Amino acid sequence: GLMQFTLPVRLCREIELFHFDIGPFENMWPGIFVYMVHRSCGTSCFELEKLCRFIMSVKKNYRRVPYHNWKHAVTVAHCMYAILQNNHTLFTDLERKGLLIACLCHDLDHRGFSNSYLQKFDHPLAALYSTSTMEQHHFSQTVSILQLEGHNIFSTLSSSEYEQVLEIIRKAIIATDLALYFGNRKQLEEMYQTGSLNLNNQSHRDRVIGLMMTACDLCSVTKLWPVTKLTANDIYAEFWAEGDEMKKLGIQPIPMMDRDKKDEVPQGQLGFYNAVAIPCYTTLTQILPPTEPLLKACRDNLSQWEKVIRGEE
Ligand SMILES: O=c1ccn(-c2cccc(OC(F)(F)F)c2)nc1-c1nc(Cl)[nH]c1-c1ccccc1
Numbered sequence: 001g002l003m004q005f006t007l008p009v010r011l012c013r014e015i016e017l018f019h020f021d022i023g024p025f026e027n028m029w030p031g032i033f034v035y036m037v038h039r040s041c042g043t044s045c046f047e048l049e050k051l052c053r054f055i056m057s058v059k060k061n062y063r064r065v066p067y068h069n070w071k072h073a074v075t076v077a078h079c080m081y082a083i084l085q086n087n088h089t090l091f092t093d094l095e096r097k098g099l100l101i102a103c104l105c106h107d108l109d110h111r112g113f114s115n116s117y118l119q120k121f122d123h124p125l126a127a128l129y130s131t132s133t134m135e136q137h138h139f140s141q142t143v144s145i146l147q148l149e150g151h152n153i154f155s156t157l158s159s160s161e162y163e164q165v166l167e168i169i170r171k172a173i174i175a176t177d178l179a180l181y182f183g184n185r186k187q188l189e190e191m192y193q194t195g196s197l198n199l200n201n202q203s204h205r206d207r208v209i210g211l212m213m214t215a216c217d218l219c220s221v222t223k224l225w226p227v228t229k230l231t232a233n234d235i236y237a238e239f240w241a242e243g244d245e246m247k248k249l250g251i252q253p254i255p256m257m258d259r260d261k262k263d264e265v266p267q268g269q270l271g272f273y274n275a276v277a278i279p280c281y282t283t284l285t286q287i288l289p290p291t292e293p294l295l296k297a298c299r300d301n302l303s304q305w306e307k308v309i310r311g312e313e
């Protein structure tokens with residue numbers, strides 16, 4: 001109860017900032033997450049014994065893949081923590097509880113492959129879930145873990161609060177399916193421009209929470225250049241492995257995933273910053289002004305990629 005977590009001074013300060021890197025020391029990541037929960041939600045919202053046991057089972061169910069791993073999970077939860085802490089009064093208690101856990105769990109048991117590769121492989125998960133394949137699996141994995149004995153961190157919520165939070169989590173996780181992001185942002189842009197946007201309309205919150213999830217999920221593009229540059233290696237390591245697996249199936253992969261076309265990465269990064277990242281953080285800044293540092297950091301990194309193409313690095 002009276003056991004707060006404390007971080008070293010640099011971390012205590014730097015953790016509040018959007019561009020914080022969680023560092024290479026795996027064994028501090030759990031404490032960093034509990035620190036975030038306690039500050040964001042209260043020392044009360046979860047029973048510590050049950051939380052710490054939830055965290056470790058979650059960790060155990062992330063795989064040793066280059067990018068969609070445990071570190072990603074915690075990094076994504078941290079970005080949401082920065083958003084929640086910079087928009088204090090906009091969010092309900094259950095929402096703050098749900099979203100941090102949602103982020104930690106959002107890529108559970110990811111194997112390193114896109115929904116497309118599963119479908120083309122004819123993986124069983126593709127039969128069980130025709131759209132948002134991995135994402136429906138991530139949420140399923142989340143509920144399974146919540147149902148382990150001693151793992152229900154929501155135990156002291158009322159029945160309705162319980163269905164409310166599991167619904168927040170389900171929508172949040174599904175929303176990290178980037179195929180759904182484009183339409184979701186288009187609608188939020190339309191609604192913000194025409195002035196219809198209304199945070200008391202539950203379905204409008206849902207969309208806004210979806211955009212936040214896209215923002216946290218992509219937050220590697222909002223780090224300092226050296227963090228962003230090095231994370232890009234891990235991302236492409238999965239992409240090329242998948243490209244290899246496509247070719248194994250007799251399918252020529254898209255250039256993004258072809259390790260022969262490694263030369264074209266810098267250009268592919270621009271496409272991505274322009275088509276996805278920049279619009280995402282733009283619309284998020286309009287809806288939630290204090291998240292601007294994410295837009296600024298992303299723009300700075302777009303420009304660092306432009307310097308790469310131009311042979312200046
Ligand atoms: O660096 C990247 C270059 C390309 N793509 C990408 C991923 C799907 C599709 C697509 O094409 C289309 F533009 F059509 F969407 C591009 N994504 C990233 C990326 N960066 C961060 Cl941080 N997270 C991702 C990411 C990881 C897994 C999955 C998705 C994104």
Ligand SMILES: [Mg+2]
Pocket residue numbers: 106107134176
């Ligand atoms: Mg995912």
Ligand SMILES: [Zn+2]
Pocket residue numbers: 072076106107176217
């Ligand atoms: Zn993710």
